[PDB]
Amino acid sequence: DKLNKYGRPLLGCTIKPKLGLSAKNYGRAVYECLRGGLDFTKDDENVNSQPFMRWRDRFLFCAEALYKAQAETGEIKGHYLNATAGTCEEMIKRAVFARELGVPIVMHDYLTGGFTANTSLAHYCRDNGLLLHIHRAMHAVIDRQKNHGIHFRVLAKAL
Amino acid sequence: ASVGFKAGVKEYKLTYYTPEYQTKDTDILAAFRVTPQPGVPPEEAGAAVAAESSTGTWTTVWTDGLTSLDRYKGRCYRIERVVGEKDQYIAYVAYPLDLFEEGSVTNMFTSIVGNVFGFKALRALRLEDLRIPPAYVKTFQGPPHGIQVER
Amino acid sequence: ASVGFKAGVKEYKLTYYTPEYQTKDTDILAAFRVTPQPGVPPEEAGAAVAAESSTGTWTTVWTDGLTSLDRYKGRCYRIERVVGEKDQYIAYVAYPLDLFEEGSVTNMFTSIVGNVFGFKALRALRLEDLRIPPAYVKTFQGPPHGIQVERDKLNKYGRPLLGCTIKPKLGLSAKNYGRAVYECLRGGLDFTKDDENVNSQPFMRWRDRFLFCAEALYKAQAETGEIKGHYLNATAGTCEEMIKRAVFARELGVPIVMHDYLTGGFTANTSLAHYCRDNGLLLHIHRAMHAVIDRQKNHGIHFRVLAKALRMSGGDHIHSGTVVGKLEGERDITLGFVDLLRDDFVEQDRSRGIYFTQDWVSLPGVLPVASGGIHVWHMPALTEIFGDDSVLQFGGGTLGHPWGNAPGAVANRVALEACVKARNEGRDLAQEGNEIIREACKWSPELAAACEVWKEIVFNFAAV
Amino acid sequence: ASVGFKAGVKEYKLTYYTPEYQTKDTDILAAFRVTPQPGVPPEEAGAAVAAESSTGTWTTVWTDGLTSLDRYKGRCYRIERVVGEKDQYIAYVAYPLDLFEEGSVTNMFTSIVGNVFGFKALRALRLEDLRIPPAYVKTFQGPPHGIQVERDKLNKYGRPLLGCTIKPKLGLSAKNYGRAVYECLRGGLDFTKDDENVNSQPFMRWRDRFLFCAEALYKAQAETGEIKGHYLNATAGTCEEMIKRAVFARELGVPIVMHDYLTGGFTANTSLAHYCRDNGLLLHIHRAMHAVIDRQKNHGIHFRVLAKALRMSGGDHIHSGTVVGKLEGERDITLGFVDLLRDDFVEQDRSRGIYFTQDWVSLPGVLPVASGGIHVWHMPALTEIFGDDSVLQFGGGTLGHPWGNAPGAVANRVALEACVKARNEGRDLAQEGNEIIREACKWSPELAAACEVWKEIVFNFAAV
Amino acid sequence: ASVGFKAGVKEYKLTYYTPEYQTKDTDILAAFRVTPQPGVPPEEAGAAVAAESSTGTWTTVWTDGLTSLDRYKGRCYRIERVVGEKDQYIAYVAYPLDLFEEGSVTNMFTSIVGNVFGFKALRALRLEDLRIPPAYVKTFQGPPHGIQVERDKLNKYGRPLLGCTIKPKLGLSAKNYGRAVYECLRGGLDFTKDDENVNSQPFMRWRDRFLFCAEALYKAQAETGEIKGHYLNATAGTCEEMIKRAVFARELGVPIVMHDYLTGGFTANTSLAHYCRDNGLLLHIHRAMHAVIDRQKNHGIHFRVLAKALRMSGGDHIHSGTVVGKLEGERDITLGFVDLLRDDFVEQDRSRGIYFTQDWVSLPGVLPVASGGIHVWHMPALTEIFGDDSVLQFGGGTLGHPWGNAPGAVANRVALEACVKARNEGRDLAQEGNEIIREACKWSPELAAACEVWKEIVFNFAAV
Amino acid sequence: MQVWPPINKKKYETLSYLPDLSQEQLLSEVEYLLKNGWVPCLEFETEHGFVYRENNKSPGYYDGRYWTMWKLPMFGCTDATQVLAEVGEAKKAYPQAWIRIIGFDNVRQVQCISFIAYKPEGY
């Protein structure tokens, strides 16, 4: 209803390389994917804030770029902004910046972050109107073997 | 950059297997216990685990030439057979400090264990140990108090 | 403990002179240039500097036995004679990591330079360099942004960034300031800025200046179609005041603020670097008061250290000196520290005064700023000595042009593009310098007017 | 305006050399000791120092006509030869009030010492004294409390306050720090304190140190029946950090905090003084780093100015030197700035290094602290030189006593009460010094022990 | 202490009459116009006024010996006979700095005017003037902005700013207020404003008026292409309410607010000035209640003092009177305090009622406002008496015009621009006044309509 | 003395203050880039010749910085002439485009160079 998208799968892309791209190049790569006709581009689940590119910098440029691409296409666009961080305070703090940018979705690695932080994030998203994409990093650590662990159907229920 | 962007798949082995490598004192090191799928050379399995853990994906993307992987790539610098063990090995991987967000175990685990345990090419994977360098150690607060203070 | 507590004085030498010592990769090392007092063996002078800088005092205290000084003691692991020099040496001291508070230049400075410079046993002391280990570097935020992001933000590549300090120093009104700003900026300067002592005074209040220079830079950016910025001085008397100003700049959408790190202090700077980081402002560091510390070759702290300290506490730009202008500064030394400011790793090079290999484990680099008594005719040298990753500032040299600011700007912007192309076509800014701007003076009316005016000026005087 | 804008350089001399000038009661005046470069007439040096310190640059800028430099220009109203000195002079400059931001030492220093010390035309520059006008004094808070309310609060009259720096410098655990503290205070010391470099480190974290020292001072106070205090170091890497520690000392109810004003910075100090004022904590200032600026007689800032700067910024205690101990300091000079620190009006007295009459218009005075390498045998001298309104500190002198802290505390309390009564009975601390403690050593076991141990120590070495 | 405590009453004279006294540059001086009671020697009267205003009471209290009254006592250093006046004198009193809380007019008035006006021994008392020393002036913020910055901001130069008070005083609906406002503003007035008793009432609530007047000035400014503003009244019953409204104007982006400083109070005023300063609003002060204090020549406070008091507390505009209109005010006196409001230095001129030289050490000056019962035919005089730096207001004179507000606006604008050019052409507003507007009424339809209606009106009545 | 005009002098960063670059001159540039190891890349814009600030005004945010990539960064190329080719190639197709040439230092990740290769008509 929000993105105005009906009848067909939404399409998306994870910018690569995984780590090592500069805030600016990330934005470049993002506009470029988006103008082509993808609905969404996104942060690789291990893209948080590192020496090669800091979260506030990436957020600012990816905002520039999706706004370019949406204008150009005339189709609402979004870029998953990764809010997964080391402390809830940091995490919400980034959530807060996406809200300031007006961007429509954020993302969170729910398992490496945790349920406690996840739920906080869902609430924050709920009240502030951002869509949250969950990335299941670490899950295969739990759900692969058929004899020991937790089956993803449970992890999926949990989310 | 350098070397034309040539689209298409290539084995991980080509960039993530580097037995040549001399570990730097600021590298995060990981001892993974890998058990490949039947036709997977350990040095491929081992490179898959290092790539999909640091900088690469499954096909060739031009963007790599924008930065420089020699600085950032995760890298499998040795394999060892698990004596008296069903095609099981010790792949050793090195991750450059630049890759991890300071103070964030959440970040560290998201990289080292985020997607690799589920590769089709592997049937089982297990992290046995991680060498945390002083340069990353000093970015954590660590315990509120610790043994002496508590006492 | 172990070894009875035996009350009484003992020479420093006994515990802090350790030539045996094998430095650890986590040790903070310091190269102090010591000049003892007549009867003081260098290794005693050297041991006092290390003791009174780390764990010890002048007499024997039982408490030492509670802990273990082997772990904590700072240690003088070598002395060297200063070839061809008045009983002057290089004492090398090593400080274990455990002694320094993380993230705090204040802490580091309190230890290494706290009390030792006033010892009666020494007559002069000077810190020349400090080796900051990666284990310590990783605990700092460093620059809010650094060279690449700054370029990336302002969208500016290939060539030195250009700037001008509005003058007179003090006395201009909120409004004149704006006027002057707009006028310099539309001409083609990238930035204008507050003089380091323009804070908030009866003649012009910070909030008034900030509101009008915003008006002006916005005018000048629309006009030219090139991102502009005006360094708004947030230096204040209290941290609260300081943040309060930074907060307004943020409200206005302007891109860079400024701070006099030494008169402000490290505690306050660190705070502003954090505030900038989180708010996305670029911060310009001004090194007022510095030469009070860094001039005499025999006593004080060398600028290369002051510079390191700042890449640690936080700053996008730092004033690095001009070699060729109104204030002191030699070329080799400057080159040395400029690499200390921008590179990732800098190899030890005594030639250039770098006593230790510095590895910055990817802390952002800082853009050096060349300012003070420089004009059109220096262009090609600055360009030469510094490279594109520098900011070159024209105060007098902009408001000093015969036709006013706009023109004075245009003159400098051409002078520099000129030099930049000469360079690119393969000319030699060092040999061919002089013709190049000379050549361009010919095709540019504004550039010409300039040339004529400052043709005969130089600041040659035998350096300290 | 008026008089056509005529581009180009001109000597400083033309506008900043004004021997004509009659200083206004509201002007900041500064005595600089200048040493020019060979071909530089003193009156040019002196005017460069005044111009590049207030309103001008190196070339002519039309903007000056927009305002009026007669109102704002800094001006060199006199030179004087330094009798029997190498082309060295005393340039005297006058700065109109309108130029400084109220309440800000940061701003004042940014102006007076900002850039002039690195002029190529000068070879050495040193600020010897600054006259602060009452119109500018009134804009400062000054000390949170000052001599009278501090004695009034702690309930302590007729004698120097006694203190001790816990040693080793770095390396003791939170717990051991408390033990040492309780032990020193129960003995009779008024205060104990953190070493200026004890902030928050791996070996001992700020909140753990604070929690145990509180437990300990509270124990010692109850035991002795005398108000005790432990200086808790609030020096931190960010203002936020700094305030945060100050806030816990408040939570524990302890009476005094401490701050290294120079490594911290005036911006952060002032913020602490304010916080201390509003929450009633006394503030102890540690002047770490000061000797980097104040040692050399030819270049730098003189402590009397650093001392002034603090009484403005805010501090209840400031380290004043000992004359007689481990670090440099001469008696007359010292007596000089000690009056600048405590008195309401201080008449000019070149004898003692005071270049201008200083009227403090009731700004509270600050308690000088005598510390570093002093012992039992120095008591009578210190008492003599400093009088009742001082804090005398025994680091080594306390923890170095053969019978540990308690006894070493007792030792110093007796030595001092000994001197005080001698004094009151009319003995002469300067002539009769030595017998007095010598006599006491005879009746006090703890004092004895001390006397025997430091008997032969002195720190005589020819001063800088 | 000294001199035994001797219980009992004594005449004031003994300690507070000191004709010996030599005033200090930091003393507050006051010129009181006293009228004793039959048997009271003026020097007693005078010393009562000085004692009961500083340190003393009616009997002898021992505590005086705890402190030193020489330091603190207020002192009557001279009386003068009021030539050709009923036992009326000028007692001159000196108050030392140390007695006043910095930044607080509240404090200063509590002392000087707290209790002496009701002594039984006096029959009438009245403060005529007060000398605020620079050391007390520098402790005030003064106007949020001042004449220069206000013009700089609104972009208005060379001529009096024009303004109108919407009428009726109370009873108009939020909506009509906005209507009336746009309509005045489009005609050419710079400002419209709330009547000083327009706060928040049943007929129209402050938030409603603010919203609509915002709509309307924004309309009018668009239309004219000339920055407009509408004084929004923030005077409220509690500081919280007051700031709260201040805050809404800020949210609307509007440029000025207003406050009745006397009925609100100094405490609330100063809060408002600070708020304005930090948030960039211009504040207009309305002197409601003042005539309660300043009319009678024998008892009260003279407006020159009330006017000084405001330039200390904070105000960008202050009503100064009209001379020529509905309420009391004589020309010379007015000329006298108008200079006290806008000038930097004002030399003493008993002619004009100024008893002391007043140096404002750069405090910004306030823009006097001419209002109440003034019209088209007063233009030339006002312009004469006040100069460009003045606000002249047309309440009735605007909503009283035969063709409504716009036209009325236009009328006053032309009238004033008319006066302005005549002045500039060299005509003589005073002699040539009358033709000048008379002339213009000829060429302006709106202006004419005006002239016709108010031609015969004047408010000549013999002053108090 | 002459009034620097306030009206049709919109700039384009580096080199835009010297006279229009001749193809030879321009050639020197691609040449330098190359000499250094920068991968040359092209981007053109046909609508927002200059930065704006429509979506946001926080510090550092400006709309209009990003341009469209012309094909891909020509990694491995060494023919100065070949990139020049491209410029030609793009004015053909986007005659109304503003076209620029940049140089990537991949080790530092900074655009080491940038100069406008072609303004559309009346700029």
Ligand SMILES: O=C(O)[C@@](O)(COP(=O)(O)O)[C@H](O)[C@H](O)COP(=O)(O)O
């Ligand atoms: O105020 C000045 O004197 C300047 O602003 C330049 O104005 P001009 O360009 O007109 O001289 C100085 O470069 C720096 O401020 C001096 O310091 P630094 O040595 O630290 O760059």
Ligand SMILES: O=C(O)[C@@](O)(COP(=O)(O)O)[C@H](O)[C@H](O)COP(=O)(O)O
């Ligand atoms: O750290 C120290 O050495 C002291 O703590 C004293 O310890 P001791 O009493 O054991 O020597 C010093 O007095 C001040 O800190 C030195 O400075 P200042 O000249 O500023 O007083």
Ligand SMILES: O=C(O)[C@@](O)(COP(=O)(O)O)[C@H](O)[C@H](O)COP(=O)(O)O
């Ligand atoms: O309410 C009023 O009467 C006015 O608003 C004027 O309205 P008109 O212009 O219609 O009279 C008066 O100027 C001030 O308000 C009176 O005082 P002041 O002496 O202090 O200026």
Ligand SMILES: [Mg+2]
């Ligand atoms: Mg992924």
Ligand SMILES: [Mg+2]
């Ligand atoms: Mg400057």
Ligand SMILES: [Mg+2]
């Ligand atoms: Mg100490």
Ligand SMILES: [Mg+2]
């Ligand atoms: Mg009214």
